[PDB]
Amino acid sequence: DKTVRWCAVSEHEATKCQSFRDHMKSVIPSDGPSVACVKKASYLDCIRAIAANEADAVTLDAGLVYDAYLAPNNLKPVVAEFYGSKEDPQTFYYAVAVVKKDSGFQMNQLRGKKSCHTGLGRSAGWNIPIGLLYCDLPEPRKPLEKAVANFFSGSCAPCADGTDFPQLCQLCPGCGCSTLNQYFGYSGAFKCLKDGAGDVAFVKHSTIFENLANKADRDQYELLCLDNTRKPVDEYKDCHLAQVPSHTVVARSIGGKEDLIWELLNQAQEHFGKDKSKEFQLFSSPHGKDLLFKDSAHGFLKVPPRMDAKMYLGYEYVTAIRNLREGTCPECKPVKWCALSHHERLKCDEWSVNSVGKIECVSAETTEDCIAKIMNGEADAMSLDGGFVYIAGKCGLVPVLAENYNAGYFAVAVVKKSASDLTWDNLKGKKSCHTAVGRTAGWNIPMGLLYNKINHCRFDEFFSEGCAPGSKKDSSLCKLCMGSGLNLCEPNNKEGYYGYTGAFRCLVEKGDVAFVKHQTVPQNTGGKNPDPWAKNLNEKDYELLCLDGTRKPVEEYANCHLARAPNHAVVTRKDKEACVHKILRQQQHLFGSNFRSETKDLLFRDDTVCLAKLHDRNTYEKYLGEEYVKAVGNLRKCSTSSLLEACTFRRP
């Protein structure tokens, strides 16, 4: 049946679950979804019941979202409660470390400072900061309060054991666990900072705004970023200890009924949600507060499919709570490289052994899966087209090293010379060949500039037909692709018109125009490419389209290009930046131009001589450049990316 077994953890919850079930029966057709109510003793029993296939769904705080994803439960987030509005939905809060302007210390210098905590046991004010700080704490690290009391010179930790650890109540004698304590709760711990008692205050992004109405006052405060720099208090999105989901419905990963759950809760919110004012109300109960959902919720949002627990919680949160849960601290260490194929994996393997392990290897099925592994620490680095750096960026990773091949490569529009009528100005109703959608040369530049002419990104209705791997299988821009069966129109090397070369091949065989890079025609003409399609081609038979409306020969790309290409680039997490720079330059200043593939273009492109420091352009926005970014923002209206949908769900 189309039935969601909801798990309750109390008699009151079970009663609301039953009223829920009975009221849904009135609003939903026989073919629609229904509720069953299962009552357990605790959130952990509910997690186990759901994993046992005795229940389907429960709503959890972020600590329990974490418990629920660990084996053997293997549960994941499927629906989010949201608070206030739509344009701004407040699905998450941010744990931040607030400090005074000019106190002159960074996160890696908290040892010896005076800390303000909302309350011992609370997330923003204790579990996250002490989680992150866990391994800077002095041995022995158990009992944990003792070790915290031995790290901050003094603190106000509400509800800590002041009697056995007085240092923790220096700033609030007694450690009062109630509002009768002036330094308790979010405003308490902030007040503790303001009133000059302490140096740092572990609170949420929003506390300072709730407690200081005038910008002038807030300008006297900053945030500690995990990168050991500071930022103003309204830049919390880029400077926080952890991003925290407020209330999260979870299911089984495999066969969890995610879709029924969403269908149920969505019709549940249209009929019974905020301000719908029926006798039954999803977000309150005469039986008690916060039953089955927070009473403060304004609705539900579907969790994007690509999302797992580790990505929903995010790197920073998992790090903090995994330290807290496991309590495991160590002794630069290996760079885990991510391979996209058996060819990349064998190359990476031989790199590992010819480098004393200073390089380890971990492989995944697509670029997006690899990126997702770098986000969450299963992996550390991989080199990416401009288009994928944008995604890796929106997903919170930074570029460290660019690939160099001599400002980098040039995106050019190639035509067959004989069709001399063809011009950049009018390609309407002509046949296009792109490397893949969301790549620099193939799409983001060409279609970038194109979007500007036609105020829309529905390109399968500008071009007659084409080959643009990563397009929807039933699009006019998959009709020229050459892969057979499931591989037709895939953006991997099982589709022969994939990449710079494929797209040129596409032009040779089927299309009018190919969007590729300046050295692509030369490398696959004159016999340099021996493959049947390329072998007998002559460079002279191909021209480039120039912006002004004219044409020029291939080798004349200097004055006939569409735009300069952001070079391909290695990317990693901010916490790995330093170490990737160190170990790759120590690998390339040994195995550089002393980058060769048993196949072709493995790991890094084969025409790659050195890996350049970026100096100051170590952000996706500063590395890709202002104009490249505007373009992709224009193109994401029509983008089909499952990772970016997940990443932008956590950061619009």
Min dist CB 570 to Cr ion, Å, is 14
392 known member of a binding site: no
> What is the number of the residue whose Cβ is closest to Cr ion?
385
3-class DSSP assignment, residue 85 = coil
Nearer to Cr ion, 103 or 519 (CB): 519
Min dist CB 400 to Cr ion, Å, is 18
Min dist CB 405 to Cr ion, Å, is 11
Nearer to Cr ion, 281 or 440 (CB): 440
- For residue 455, CA distances in Å to 315, 403, 449, 634, 635 come to 37, 33, 10, 9, 11
Applying CB under 5 A, does 403 fall inside the site for Cr ion? no
Min dist CB 610 to Cr ion, Å, is 17
Min dist CB 441 to Cr ion, Å, is 5
To 10 degrees, the CA torsion angle through 465, 466, 468, 472? Answer: 30
Nearer to Cr ion, 519 or 529 (CB): 519
439 known member of a binding site: yes
Letters for 571-600 (x = contact with Cr ion by CB under 5 A, - = none) are ------------------------------
Applying CB under 5 A, does 385 fall inside the site for Cr ion? yes
Give the position of tokens 């057709």.
29
If phi > 0 it is left, if psi is from -120 to 50 it is alpha, else beta; for residue 175 that is: left
56 known member of a binding site: no
Min dist CB 335 to Cr ion, Å, is 22
Span of 146-154, 270-278, 380-388, 464-472 interacting with Cr ion by CB under 5 A: 380-388
State how beta strands 114-117 and 230-231 pair: unpaired
Spatial strand order of the sheet with 299-302 comes to: 58-60, 248-252, 75-82, 299-302
Min dist CB 369 to Cr ion, Å, is 19
Cα–Cα dist 109/639, whole Å:
43
How many chain residues touch Cr ion (CB under 5 A)?
2
Nearer to Cr ion, 344 or 385 (CB): 385
Closest CA to 21 of 280, 385, 315: 280
Nearer to Cr ion, 269 or 440 (CB): 440
Applying CB under 5 A, does 501 fall inside the site for Cr ion? no
Closest CA to 563 of 457, 445, 443, 390: 445
Nearer to Cr ion, 317 or 515 (CB): 515
| Phi, psi (rounded to 5 degrees) for 24 | -60, -45
Min dist CB 403 to Cr ion, Å, is 9
Q: What is the CA radius of gyration of the chain?
A: 28
Span of 87-95, 362-370, 385-393, 614-622 interacting with Cr ion by CB under 5 A: 385-393
Nearer to Cr ion, 155 or 444 (CB): 444
585 known member of a binding site: no
Min dist CB 497 to Cr ion, Å, is 16
271 known member of a binding site: no
242 known member of a binding site: no
How many CA atoms are closer than 13 Å to the CA of 201, on its beta-carbon side? 30
449-460 core/surface letters (b: 16 or more CB in 10 A; e: else): bbbeeeeebebb
Nearer to Cr ion, 41 or 407 (CB): 407
- Which residue type is seen at 174? G
Nearer to Cr ion, 125 or 566 (CB): 566
Cα–Cα dist 99/108, whole Å:
14
The pair of three-digit structure tokens given for residue 40, joined into one six-digit string: 């357990």
If phi > 0 it is left, if psi is from -120 to 50 it is alpha, else beta; for residue 601 that is: left
Span of 43-51, 113-121, 217-225, 377-385 interacting with Cr ion by CB under 5 A: 377-385
Min dist CB 503 to Cr ion, Å, is 11
Helices assigned H by DSSP within 114-206: 128-133, 144-149, 185-194
First to last CA, the chain: 37
- Which residue type is seen at 520? T
| Phi, psi (rounded to 5 degrees) for 137 | -70, 150
Choosing from 19, 59, 285, 440, the residue that interacts with Cr ion (CB under 5 A) is 440
Chain length of the chain: 652
Span of 163-171, 222-230, 393-401, 435-443 interacting with Cr ion by CB under 5 A: 435-443
Dihedral over Cα of 284, 287, 293, 294: its sign: positive
Return all residues near 141 (Cβ < 8 A) that are at least 6 apart.
134, 147, 327, 329
Min dist CB 508 to Cr ion, Å, is 20
435 known member of a binding site: yes
183 known member of a binding site: no
Cα–Cα dist 401/383, whole Å:
9
| Phi, psi (rounded to 5 degrees) for 461 | -115, 5
Span of 19-27, 182-190, 225-233, 378-386 interacting with Cr ion by CB under 5 A: 378-386
568 known member of a binding site: yes
Q: For residues 67-86, which are near Cr ion according to CB under 5 A?
A: none
| Phi, psi (rounded to 5 degrees) for 602 | -75, 150
Span of 78-86, 227-235, 438-446, 629-637 interacting with Cr ion by CB under 5 A: 438-446
Return all residues near 115 (Cβ < 8 A) that are at least 6 apart.
129, 152, 154, 155, 156, 157, 198, 199, 200, 201, 202
3-class DSSP assignment, residue 46 = helix
Min dist CB 440 to Cr ion, Å, is 4
Span of 197-205, 346-354, 439-447, 508-516 interacting with Cr ion by CB under 5 A: 439-447
Return all residues near 149 (Cβ < 8 A) that are at least 6 apart.
155, 160, 165, 166, 167, 168
Nearer to Cr ion, 19 or 440 (CB): 440
Span of 222-230, 254-262, 382-390, 587-595 interacting with Cr ion by CB under 5 A: 382-390
Give the position of tokens 């005795």.
54
Span of 145-153, 274-282, 383-391, 547-555 interacting with Cr ion by CB under 5 A: 383-391
Nearer to Cr ion, 92 or 504 (CB): 504
Min dist CB 460 to Cr ion, Å, is 22
Return binding residues for hydrogencarbonate: 118, 122, 124-125, 435, 439, 441-442
Return binding residues: 61, 93, 118, 122, 124-125, 186, 247, 385, 409, 435, 439, 441-442, 500, 568
Binding site for Cr ion (CB under 5 A): 385, 440
Return binding residues for Fe(3+): 61, 93, 186, 247, 385, 409, 500, 568
